Write a protein that binds this ligand. Structure first.
Ligand SMILES: *[C@@H]1O[C@H](CO)[C@@H](O[C@@H]2O[C@H](CO)[C@@H](O[C@@H]3O[C@H](CO[C@H]4O[C@H](CO[C@H]5O[C@H](CO)[C@@H](O)[C@H](O)[C@@H]5O)[C@@H](O)[C@H](O[C@H]5O[C@H](CO)[C@@H](O)[C@H](O)[C@@H]5O)[C@@H]4O)[C@@H](O)[C@H](O[C@H]4O[C@H](CO)[C@@H](O)[C@H](O)[C@@H]4O[C@H]4O[C@H](CO)[C@@H](O)[C@H](O)[C@@H]4O)[C@@H]3O)[C@H](O)[C@H]2NC(C)=O)[C@H](O)[C@H]1NC(C)=O
Ligand SMILES: *[C@@H]1O[C@H](CO)[C@@H](O[C@@H]2O[C@H](CO)[C@@H](O[C@@H]3O[C@H](CO[C@H]4O[C@H](CO[C@H]5O[C@H](CO)[C@@H](O)[C@H](O)[C@@H]5O)[C@@H](O)[C@H](O[C@H]5O[C@H](CO)[C@@H](O)[C@H](O)[C@@H]5O)[C@@H]4O)[C@@H](O)[C@H](O[C@H]4O[C@H](CO)[C@@H](O)[C@H](O)[C@@H]4O)[C@@H]3O)[C@H](O)[C@H]2NC(C)=O)[C@H](O)[C@H]1NC(C)=O
Ligand SMILES: *[C@@H]1O[C@H](CO)[C@@H](O[C@@H]2O[C@H](CO)[C@@H](O[C@@H]3O[C@H](CO[C@H]4O[C@H](CO)[C@@H](O)[C@H](O)[C@@H]4O)[C@@H](O)[C@H](O[C@H]4O[C@H](CO)[C@@H](O)[C@H](O)[C@@H]4O)[C@@H]3O)[C@H](O)[C@H]2NC(C)=O)[C@H](O)[C@H]1NC(C)=O
Ligand SMILES: *[C@@H]1O[C@H](CO)[C@@H](O[C@@H]2O[C@H](CO)[C@@H](O[C@@H]3O[C@H](CO)[C@@H](O)[C@H](O)[C@@H]3O)[C@H](O)[C@H]2NC(C)=O)[C@H](O)[C@H]1NC(C)=O
Ligand SMILES: *[C@@H]1O[C@H](CO)[C@@H](O[C@@H]2O[C@H](CO)[C@@H](O[C@@H]3O[C@H](CO)[C@@H](O)[C@H](O)[C@@H]3O)[C@H](O)[C@H]2NC(C)=O)[C@H](O)[C@H]1NC(C)=O
Ligand code: MAN
Lengths: 128, 56, 107
């Protein structure tokens, strides 16, 4: 079922990389697209990067356009957001979720997507 | 004769792709004793219409 | 990639409140749904209205979304302190972005 595990942040200085990992267990890991959404500490929703259940297709938000490489371990069933070039401009906290209008898709084109699961998020502070 | 049938036999396997794109659920009903009947529990997924494609 | 979310919705406790989270040809004119997200003060938001008009569990019928052409607006009745909370919409963009967001709104 839905038992997500956010982690991977870091208390670092600007100009580096970091690895994030949501873990969801006892369910199809390779059975739902998940996405990434942060929150500047006092601000709103910011989608980061999408992924396939297999990661075959991924797209990233404008804010971190092609800067954080999202992927996932498939057989071990982990997700690996290798963020790269961390900067103070992105000081925030981060959160992990996925979309689920799936039950019955009444179209050739979707109504959109959801963000159903939440968790602790992660702690990122890349600055001195 | 117009009362027979013409049996055509091709050289080239003209493909056809058929599908039923539903995730359908099997609901078991016990018509007891011991006999059980498989009904269509429900349908989930892209409710398209069952069909077949062929290269025109 | 911003939804016209009012920076503040108002209503005395019990009063009806409405929020017009509207976009463009590109997001609600695009044909998708306004997946609102209710947030509590200090807590993580959640799905309150998916399908742009549909309730999930635990959401009173006082709370209901709706999508009318290029407009998308929510309805709350009997607004109270348990209802005086944050709301953030989000949907699809046909032009450049995945997830358009409104500015957020609390009572
Ligand atoms: C028999 O034949 C019939 C007909 O010949 C076949 O029917 C057709 O089958 C296909 C595949 O089975 C179906 O495809 C579905 O297409 C819809 C609509 O896709 C729209 O968006 C595409 C993307 O556009 C955006 O992205 C790009 C890049 O950023 C931008 O440039 C764009 O501007 C947008 O931002 C777009 O490519 C599509 O264009 C279509 O038309 C053009 C015309 O010019 C063609 O070239 C294209 O190739 C394309 O055909 C179109 O505008 C999609 O919604 C479906 O994709 C969903 O499912 C995918 C499955 O892999 C998934 O990967 C996608 O990501 C997408 O999932 C999305 O939605 C999910 C929620 O629902 C999300 O969770 C997910 O993350 C993502 O958000 C799908 O690809 C046709 O609908 C279907 N048509 C009909 C009439 O039946 C049939 O398959 C054949 N069968 C057999 C057995 O032979
Ligand atoms: C048709 O529809 C059904 C739903 O109606 C859909 O079912 C989902 O199928 C996915 C497969 O893609 C399931 O994901 C896998 O689950 C593996 C273990 O499955 C067992 O446990 C699942 C968790 O539920 C537990 O808790 C509930 C609580 O109430 C309990 O009922 C359960 O019995 C169980 O104890 C459970 O969902 C699952 O039963 C569903 O799943 C099977 C397929 O697995 C599906 O065919 C059934 O119809 C049933 O709906 C079963 O009981 C899990 O081990 C596996 O994870 C491994 O691989 C992944 C790869 O991503 C790794 O991430 C992971 O670390 C492991 O290595 C995998 O996650 C999923 O759980 C179902 N439900 C949901 C909500 O996703 C079918 O797939 C649809 N399609 C078809 C063709 O039938
Ligand atoms: C029923 O459904 C099945 C599966 O959907 C169809 O089988 C597919 O048939 C198509 C038609 O030929 C195949 O598509 C072609 O495959 C060729 C060989 O595949 C290589 O290249 C692809 C990339 O396209 C690689 O991913 C793959 O690993 C192989 O290395 C390609 O050479 C073709 O590309 C060429 O033509 C296209 C024009 O469409 C150009 O855009 C390309 O640039 C290139 O010039 C094309 O991709 C497909 O491979 C088959 N499926 C599979 C799994 O292989 C049936 O045809 C379908 N039947 C009916 C009646 O609908
Ligand atoms: C295959 O079927 C055809 C019918 O489609 C058969 O041809 C028919 O044969 C009968 C007699 O064998 C014909 O009846 C008579 O034919 C003569 C001469 O054609 C005519 O003058 C008479 O008025 C009467 O109709 C019939 O007309 C004819 N029909 C056609 C359409 O040809 C044929 O015999 C069958 N194959 C074999 C091997 O028998
Ligand atoms: C076929 O029609 C029947 C109705 O004759 C549908 O059965 C009923 O469906 C509803 C929802 O579709 C179920 O509602 C549930 O009721 C319980 C108890 O009242 C409530 O606590 C739940 O919150 C929910 O509202 C209801 O259980 C169900 N009844 C039975 C006997 O199954 C049925 O869903 C239809 N078939 C399909 C495939 O939709
Ligand atoms: O705009 C982002 C959005 O565009 C469209 C599709 O490519 C999706 O996979 C993607 O997430």
């Amino acid at each position: 079922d839905i038992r997500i595990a956010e982690s991977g942040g870091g208390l670092v200085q600007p100009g580096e990389s970091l690895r994030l990992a949501c873990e969801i267990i006892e369910l199809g890991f390779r059975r739902a697209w998940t996405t990434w959404v942060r929150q500047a500490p006092g601000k709103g929703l910011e989608w980061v990067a999408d992924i396939n259940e297999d990661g075959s297709e991924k797209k990233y938000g404008p804010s971190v356009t092609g800067r954080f490489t999202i992927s996932r371990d498939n057989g071990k069933n982990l997700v690996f957001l290798q963020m790269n070039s961390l900067r103070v401009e992105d000081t925030a906290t981060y959160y992990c979720a996925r979309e689920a209008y799936h039950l019955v898709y009444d179209d050739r084109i979707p109504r959109g997507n959801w963000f159903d699961p939440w968790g602790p998020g992660t702690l990122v502070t890349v600055s001195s | 004769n117009n009362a027979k049938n013409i049996l055509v036999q091709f050289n080239t396997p003209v493909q056809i792709n058929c599908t039923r794109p539903n995730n359908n659920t099997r609901k078991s009903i016990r018509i007891g004793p011991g006999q059980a009947f498989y009904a269509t529990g429900d349908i989930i997924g892209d409710i398209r219409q069952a069909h077949c494609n062929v290269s025109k | 990639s911003v939804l016209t979310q009012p920076p503040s919705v108002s209503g005395a406790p019990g009063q009806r409140v409405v929020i017009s989270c509207t976009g463009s040809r590109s997001n609600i004119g695009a044909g998708y749904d306004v997946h609102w997200y209710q947030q509590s003060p200090g807590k993580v938001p959640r799905i309150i209205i998916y399908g742009s008009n549909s309730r999930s569990s635990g959401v009173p019928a006082r709370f209901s979304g709706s999508k009318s052409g290029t407009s998308a607006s929510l309805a709350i009745t009997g607004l109270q302190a348990e209802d005086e909370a944050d709301y953030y919409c989000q949907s699809y963009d046909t032009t450049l972005t995945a997830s358009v967001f409104g500015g957020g709104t609390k009572v």
